[PDB]
Design an enzyme around this catalytic site. Structure first.
Site, PDB file in Angstrom:
ATOM      1  N   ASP A  37       0.785  -1.236   0.000  1.00  0.00           N
ATOM      2  CA  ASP A  37       0.000   0.000   0.000  1.00  0.00           C
ATOM      3  C   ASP A  37       0.823   1.295   0.000  1.00  0.00           C
ATOM      4  O   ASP A  37       1.355   1.707   1.031  1.00  0.00           O
ATOM      5  CB  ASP A  37      -0.929  -0.013   1.218  1.00  0.00           C
ATOM      6  CG  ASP A  37      -1.908   1.139   1.225  1.00  0.00           C
ATOM      7  OD1 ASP A  37      -2.767   1.202   0.322  1.00  0.00           O
ATOM      8  OD2 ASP A  37      -1.822   1.985   2.140  1.00  0.00           O
ATOM      9  N   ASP A 233      -1.924   5.290  -5.384  1.00  0.00           N
ATOM     10  CA  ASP A 233      -2.107   4.327  -4.302  1.00  0.00           C
ATOM     11  C   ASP A 233      -2.497   2.921  -4.724  1.00  0.00           C
ATOM     12  O   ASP A 233      -3.641   2.657  -5.097  1.00  0.00           O
ATOM     13  CB  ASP A 233      -3.130   4.868  -3.304  1.00  0.00           C
ATOM     14  CG  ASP A 233      -3.456   3.876  -2.206  1.00  0.00           C
ATOM     15  OD1 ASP A 233      -2.563   3.083  -1.834  1.00  0.00           O
ATOM     16  OD2 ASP A 233      -4.605   3.902  -1.705  1.00  0.00           O
TER      17      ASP A 233
END
Lengths: 390, 7
Positions: A37, A233
């Site tokens: 992440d 992201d």
């Protein structure tokens, strides 16, 4: 070429549930699947039995575990968890051959964080300290990695979307991509790599200076495109856009595909649409181009995705032989988010060392015989600094 | 889907 063979194909998963890499924490090493992440900065893992976890971190079994006697809470756009801070030895089986002591949040409580069937039990926040919890004094994993080893301050990600639904067993059996730590593998992309500056080191923030739907300029004040920020992201499924931009883009995407009408639930990313096996009318959907600020003054480049990227494959309710998808573009109230579906079309290089992010056509991006994703430039663009929101 | 930090 095959610069980093030991790290190629070290990821598994998909846009909908996330891509994860295998990691080991503690002594003896405890194996755990960690979600990659870039939208956060905390390294945390499940530390207690959970209905969605097959395994978890067990501090009382790690001889090298260190208690920091401090609690930590981390909320995301969707989902959150609470846990206890500590440090331990960490390693990445399919990555550089080193072991480092890193901060680790042992998740003791969580809500809507873990995903049933995702197969990952923790998360690797690859962003900067600035947005770390409880504060920027908690050194993020990659930082610890660079300070303690000779691994270059850089990593690249190749998330590979299958282009069709993957059932539990096959998601576990298939290769979901590569996370090259400390380098750039040339076999993961074609064409040239174009770089956009990292506006500020907290989230991996960039500046979008123009948007086109099938060549047509969305024609909005570029500040809108970055209100209140624009980040990359891997932990977000869809390409999320700020309300006003979302409304304009959907209006344009609807006009370009007007030969077919779809229900609102579809454009709201809530419901899927299906087509007879192999008849998805890709050509009626437009390509989307996002221009990004370049490294050279008044220069920009663009990345272009196909509907094969923004239409996310999902198995039909009646498990039919139809090809079904969901609109993987949605509204946002916290700025733009170039998520997995956008990334699945490119090889993204996070050049922390040179404070820049590079994009290149992914050698594993899904397309058809008439169109392919693209990265092109340069383009003369003025006052790009002004596209950034303050 | 996944929507991973709030600042």
């Amino acid at each position: 070429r095959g610069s980093f063979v030991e790290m190629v194909d070290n990821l598994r998963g998909k846009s909908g549930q996330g891509y994860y890499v295998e990691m080991t924490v503690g002594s003896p090493p405890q194996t755990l699947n960690i979600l990659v992440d870039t939208g956060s900065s905390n390294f945390a893992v499940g530390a207690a039995p959970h209905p969605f976890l097959h395994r978890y971190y067990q501090r009382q079994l790690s001889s090298t575990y260190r208690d920091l006697r401090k609690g930590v809470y981390v909320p995301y756009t969707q989902g959150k968890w609470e846990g206890e801070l500590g440090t331990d030895l960490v390693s990445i089986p399919h990555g550089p051959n080193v072991t480092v002591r890193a901060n680790i949040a042992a998740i003791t409580e969580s809500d809507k964080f873990f995903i049933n069937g995702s197969n990952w039990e923790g998360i690797l926040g690859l962003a900067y300290a600035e947005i770390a919890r409880p504060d920027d004094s908690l050194e993020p994993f990659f930082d610890s990695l660079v300070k303690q080893t000779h691994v270059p301050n850089l990593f690249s990600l190749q998330l590979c979307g299958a282009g069709f639904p993957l059932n539990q067993s096959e998601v576990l059996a298939s290769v979901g991509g590569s996370m090259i730590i400390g380098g750039i593998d040339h076999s993961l992309y074609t064409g040239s790599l174009w770089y956009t500056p990292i506006r500020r080191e907290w989230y991996y923030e960039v500046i979008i200076v123009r948007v086109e739907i099938n060549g047509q300029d969305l024609k909005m004040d570029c500040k809108e495109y970055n209100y209140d920020k624009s980040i990359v992201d891997s932990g977000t499924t869809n390409l999320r856009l700020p309300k006003k931009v979302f409304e304009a883009a959907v209006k344009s995407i609807k006009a370009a595909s007007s030969t077919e009408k779809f229900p609102d639930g579809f454009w709201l990313g809530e419901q899927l649409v299906c087509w007879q096996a192999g008849t998805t009318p890709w050509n009626i959907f437009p390509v989307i181009s996002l221009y990004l600020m370049g490294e050279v003054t008044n220069q920009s480049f663009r990345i272009t995705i196909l509907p094969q990227q923004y239409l996310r494959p999902v198995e039909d309710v009646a498990t039919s032989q139809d090809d079904c998808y969901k609109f993987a573009i949605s509204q946002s109230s916290t700025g733009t988010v170039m998520g997995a579906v956008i990334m699945e079309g490119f090889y993204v290089v996070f050049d922390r060392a040179r404070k820049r992010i590079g994009f290149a056509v992914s050698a594993c991006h899904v397309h058809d015989e008439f169109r392919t994703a693209a990265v092109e430039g340069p383009f003369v663009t003025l006052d790009m600094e002004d596209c950034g929101y303050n | 889907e996944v929507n991973x930090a709030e600042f």
